[PDB]
């Protein structure tokens, strides 16, 4: 509806979550040439010794690779000097941060949504080798990372973390985007009810939808 | 240059190989065998010569799209956050980005970015915002802190506080819609002006 | 396994034998390989010291100073339960270290623990800043190789030269 | 062949996967340690802040933005008259409710009266294309004359 005078404002707004959803690592196949192509014989390793350094090169290669899923899942996660911790009590001004903050009643420290991610997603001289950072100790930053966030915003990025109320990092937040902070005390009920209700969206989605993951089961 | 010199030795080594032939050295074959059998000997010598660079060249064509993703990035960090400044957060090191001086090194860039870093700090009670005449308060350039027994408003990013005013200040609704609002007074320049 | 009569053996997807009908005794009997694993071994640098210990990656420690990692069987290396930066990985969270001597292995450290004094009506402002240069360092050139193939295959050789065409 | 062939194909895998790994560390810097004004690289609306979480394999964020979602037509006018002297917003937007002009943020529909406080002044009414009359309100003066 364009015109020479005529504009468009907002009169309400929704708080949104959506999920982003990427691959950080290859399982961390290893493999002896050697056994692959000569397994048990020493005559056919007598022959194959002959092509040089082709033996020796693939698992060269493949070591490259196998070292690399680690400095991948380090630089994605291992951001955070220190691990972050939230306070026993949640005034966090609303915003019910329950289903993403960890479960400390579960053997691995993940949170409810977390554990429908792990839910979702599936002899010969050929190996796998192990992450070097286990699942939970993944859970342990993603954790510190959301604590650091919850409690102290951008700050733990910049050098040491400084605490803030919650919903007064909203305030930071909505003047990131331009929109004044009066519009968020003037609705903070109604912003952290929405996102809340979008939360809860997220799991009955990932809860519903088995195919959610196709970016990781395809990796 | 320790990948880009081993590719070479590697393939460099991949020549005293005998790939399933009598003997690896040329003339040995030909100096030896008559041409119906020195060629099938040396088919296979270059057979195994040949799968040798094919090899060493996926490599280094797989090497330089990565060396070439490395420079896209040094280009992306030199045109960002040398010809600028970066908001973007740990993109040019821990901190907050002022700028950086770019440094030449064998077949690399070297940054010195210089980073503002958030040092020593003081605890503070704070509010979303203040009452004074029923109206609601909220900063303009900061944030509300009380040092324990005086109220002020301080930039967000160091402790430099100021009298709480209406330019220090704006307003929007009344106190019943804030929650977490304290009651403080609000300073006016304009009042002592006006009477005198 | 349920084998029909007439068959003498099993294959395996790889076509090598999964089992057989043994030929005296009427019974089925199953093929395992041999365990193996690879052999890896953490050095604390000869520079330092000329310890070293080794892990059989995979296997049980069964068929091998010990230690089972979920990565395999570790030999040589005193576990610890205390936990430190990561000095050589391992695997599984594990990493070693050699430490005042020997070699040592435990869970490493992810960061320095940091509950964060959070309330609804406090924030913390610095009253001072430090200004820090870090380097950051990226590739931004290989070498620039060219090869003639034709003397890497053929060199000092028609004879060679008139099969590579 | 067989070996060389799969050991390419990973190889090759890997620098696909370590596109994605950089991407989500650059993602997680910004996106996470910071807010991204960025536009869609944090997902559709403008960019309040987002959360990590572990995946097999992988990352997950929750992406938390702001979407404006009701929205009216109004009026508007790049500048407005007062004293032949021309007058623009120091933040936000001319709008007409369609009998008062009022000054707006421009991403929520909040009119406030126009005023020196709310405004600044360069040239005239002469230069600037569109402007049309209004009536600045000026706090001072009642405060002056009382
Ligand atoms: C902005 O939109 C929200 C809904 O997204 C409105 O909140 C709802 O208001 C209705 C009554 O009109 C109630 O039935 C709902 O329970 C409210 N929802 C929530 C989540 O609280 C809100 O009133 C609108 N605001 C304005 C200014 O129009
Ligand atoms: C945060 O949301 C959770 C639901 O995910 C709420 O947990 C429920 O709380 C009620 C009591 O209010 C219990 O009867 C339910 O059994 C709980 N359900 C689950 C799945 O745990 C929780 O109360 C909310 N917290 C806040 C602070 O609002
Ligand atoms: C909070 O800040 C105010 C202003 O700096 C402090 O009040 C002043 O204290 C000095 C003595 O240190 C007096 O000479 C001034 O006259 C005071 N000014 C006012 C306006 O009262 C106050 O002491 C600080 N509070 C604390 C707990 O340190
Ligand atoms: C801020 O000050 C006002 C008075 O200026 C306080 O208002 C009182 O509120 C209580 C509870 O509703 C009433 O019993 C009193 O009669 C009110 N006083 C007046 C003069 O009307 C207000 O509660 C104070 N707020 C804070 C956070 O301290
Ligand atoms: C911020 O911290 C620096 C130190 O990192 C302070 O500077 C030092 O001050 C002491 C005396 O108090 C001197 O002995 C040092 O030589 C100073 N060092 C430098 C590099 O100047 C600085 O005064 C502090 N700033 C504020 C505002 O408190
Ligand atoms: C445009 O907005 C103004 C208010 O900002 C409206 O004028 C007010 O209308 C109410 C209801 O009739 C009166 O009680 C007020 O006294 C009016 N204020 C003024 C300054 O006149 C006006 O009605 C709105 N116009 C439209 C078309 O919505
Ligand atoms: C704003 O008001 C002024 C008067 O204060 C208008 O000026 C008139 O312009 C026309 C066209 O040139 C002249 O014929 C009139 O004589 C002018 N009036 C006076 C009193 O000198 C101006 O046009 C108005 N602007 C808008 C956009 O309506
Ligand atoms: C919020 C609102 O009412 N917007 C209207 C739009 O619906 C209508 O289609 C257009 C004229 O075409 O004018 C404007
Ligand atoms: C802030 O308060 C906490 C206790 O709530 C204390 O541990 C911390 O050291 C204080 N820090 C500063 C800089 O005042
Ligand atoms: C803040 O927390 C305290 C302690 O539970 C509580 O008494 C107070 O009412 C809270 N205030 C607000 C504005 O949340
Ligand atoms: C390590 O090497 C240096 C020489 O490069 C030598 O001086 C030093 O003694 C060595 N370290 C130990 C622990 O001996
Ligand atoms: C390893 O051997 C022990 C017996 O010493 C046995 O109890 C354990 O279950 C075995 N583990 C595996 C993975 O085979
Ligand atoms: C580690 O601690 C547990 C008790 O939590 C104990 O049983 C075990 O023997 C300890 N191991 C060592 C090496 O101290
Ligand atoms: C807007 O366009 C109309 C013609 O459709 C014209 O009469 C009017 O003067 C124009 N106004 C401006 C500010 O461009």
């Not at chain 1, 020479?4 to 196949?29: D, G, Y």
């Not at chain 1, 979702?120 to 604590?147: C, H, R, W």
């Not at chain 1, 331009?178 to 809860?207: C, H, M, P, R, W």
């Not at chain 1, 519903?208 to 990796?219: I, P, Y």
Request: hydrophobic share 35%; with cysteine.
């Amino acid at each position: 509806a364009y015109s020479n005078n005529s504009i468009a404002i907002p009169t309400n707004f929704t708080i949104s979550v959506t999920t982003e959803i990427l691959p950080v690592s290859m399982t961390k196949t290893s493999v002896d040439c050697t056994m692959y192509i000569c397994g048990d014989s020493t005559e056919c390793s007598n022959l194959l010794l002959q092509y040089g350094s082709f033996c020796t090169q693939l698992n060269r290669a493949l070591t490259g690779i196998a070292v690399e899923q680690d400095k991948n899942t380090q630089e994605v996660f291992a951001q955070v000097k220190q691990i972050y911790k939230t306070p026993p009590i949640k005034d966090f001004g609303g915003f019910n941060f329950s289903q993403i903050l960890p479960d400390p009643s579960k053997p691995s420290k993940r949170s409810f949504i977390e554990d429908l991610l792990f839910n979702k997603v599936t002899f010969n001289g050929l190996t796998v080798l192990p992450p070097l950072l286990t699942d939970e100790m993944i859970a342990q930053y993603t954790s510190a990372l959301l604590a650091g966030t919850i409690t102290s915003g951008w700050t733990f990025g910049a050098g040491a973390a400084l605490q803030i109320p919650f919903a007064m990092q909203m305030a930071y937040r909505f003047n990131g985007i331009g929109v004044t902070q009066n519009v968020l005390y003037e609705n903070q009920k109604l912003i952290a009810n929405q996102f809340n209700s979008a939360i809860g969206k997220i799991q009955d989605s990932l809860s519903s939808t088995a195919s959610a993951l196709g970016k990781l089961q395809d990796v | 240059v320790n990948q880009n010199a081993q590719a070479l030795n590697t393939l460099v080594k991949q020549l005293s190989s005998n790939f399933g032939a009598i003997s690896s050295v040329l003339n040995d074959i030909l100096s030896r065998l008559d041409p119906p059998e020195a060629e099938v000997q040396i088919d296979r010598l270059i057979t195994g010569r040949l799968q040798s660079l094919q090899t060493y060249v996926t490599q280094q064509l797989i090497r330089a799209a990565e060396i070439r993703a490395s420079a896209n990035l040094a280009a992306t960090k030199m045109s960002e956050c040398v010809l600028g400044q970066s908001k973007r957060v740990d993109f040019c090191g821990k901190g907050y980005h002022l700028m950086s001086f770019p440094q030449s090194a064998p077949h690399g860039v070297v940054f010195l970015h210089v980073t503002y870093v958030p040092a020593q700090e003081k605890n503070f009670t704070t509010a979303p915002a203040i009452c004074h005449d029923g109206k609601a308060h909220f900063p303009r350039e900061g944030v509300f802190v009380s040092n324990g027994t005086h109220w002020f408003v301080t930039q967000r990013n160091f402790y430099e506080p100021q009298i709480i005013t209406t330019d220090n200040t704006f307003v929007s609704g009344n106190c019943d819609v804030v929650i977490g609002i304290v009651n403080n007074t609000v300073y006016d320049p304009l009042q002592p002006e006006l009477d005198s | 396994k349920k084998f029909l009569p007439f068959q003498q053996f099993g294959r395996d997807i790889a076509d090598t034998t999964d089992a057989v009908r043994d030929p005296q005794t009427l019974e089925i009997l199953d093929i395992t390989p041999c365990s193996f694993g690879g052999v890896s071994v953490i050095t604390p640098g000869t520079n330092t010291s000329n310890q070293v210990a080794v892990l059989y990656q995979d296997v049980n420690c069964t068929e091998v100073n010990v230690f089972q990692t979920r990565a395999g069987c570790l030999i040589g290396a005193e576990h610890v339960n205390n936990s430190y930066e990561c000095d050589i990985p391992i695997g599984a969270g594990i990493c070693a270290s050699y430490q005042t001597q020997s070699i040592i292995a435990y869970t490493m450290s992810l960061g320095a623990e940091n509950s964060v004094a959070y309330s609804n009506n406090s924030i913390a402002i610095p009253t001072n800043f430090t200004i820090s240069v870090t380097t950051e360092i990226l590739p931004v050139s290989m070498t620039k190789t060219s090869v003639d193939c034709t003397m890497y295959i053929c060199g000092d050789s028609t004879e060679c030269s008139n099969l590579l065409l």
